[PDB]
Swiss-Prot record:
InterPro entries: Peptide_deformylase (IPR023635), Peptide_deformylase_sf (IPR036821)
Organism of this sequence: Escherichia coli (strain K12)
Function: Removes the formyl group from the N-terminal Met of newly synthesized proteins. Requires at least a dipeptide for an efficient rate of reaction. N-terminal L-methionine is a prerequisite for activity but the enzyme has broad specificity at other positions.
Family membership noted in the UniProt record: Belongs to the polypeptide deformylase family.
Signal peptide: none
Binding site for Fe cation: 90, 132, 136
GO molecular function, one term: zinc ion binding
Record: active site: 133
Record-given protein name: Peptide deformylase
Essential cofactor(s): Fe(2+); Zn(2+)
Cofactor, free-text remark: Upon overproduction is isolated with 1 Fe(2+) ion per monomer, a Ni(2+)-bound form is as active while a Zn(2+)-bound form is inactive.
EC code(s) of this entry: 3.5.1.88
Catalytic activity line of the entry: N-terminal N-formyl-L-methionyl-[peptide] + H2O = N-terminal L-methionyl-[peptide] + formate
Subunit record text: Monomer.
Amino acid sequence: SVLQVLHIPDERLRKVAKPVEEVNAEIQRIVDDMFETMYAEEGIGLAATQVDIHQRIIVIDVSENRDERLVLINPELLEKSGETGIEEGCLSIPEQRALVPRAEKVKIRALDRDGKPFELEADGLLAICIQHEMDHLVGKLFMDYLSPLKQQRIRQKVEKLDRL
Ligand SMILES: CCCCC[C@H](CC(=O)NO)C(=O)N[C@H](C(=O)N1CCC[C@H]1CO)C(C)C
Ligand code: NI
């Protein structure tokens, strides 16, 4: 199923996700529906918070052909280094993008779609995406790193888009 993606200024986007207790069929249904949503909305990642599921579940596909699924369940940041920043957009902040500071590289541990633990070192866009996705799990959005003026401008554009 394709799920509705919450948009600013919805307060549900600020909720802090709980850890997944067990990776079972219910969770796999959620993961699969998150992928479907992500692809339908042309994203490269999605966090459960965005679909109003406050659990630490993240789906990602940063591949050119959009056929490389990555699942981060209960991700934990182990190490990071350097700094970087690209103009990021967000499906909860439709059509707006801005550069925000991010770690260049990250090493994380998480559970996959089967509930098996794995470690992953990432750089480039994957590291940026992980960070963005992990921020959604603690109720944080890319616009939070910007000035009040920029935040207000983004808020108004999203509301108008949604109004139309
Ligand atoms: C880059 C950090 C991760 C961005 C994730 C968002 C999806 C999101 O809202 N997840 O929470 C995305 O797909 N955004 C895209 C995005 O920002 N992109 C896609 C290509 C790289 C970057 C643009 O610079 C477009 C659809 C707005
Ligand atoms: Ni986002």
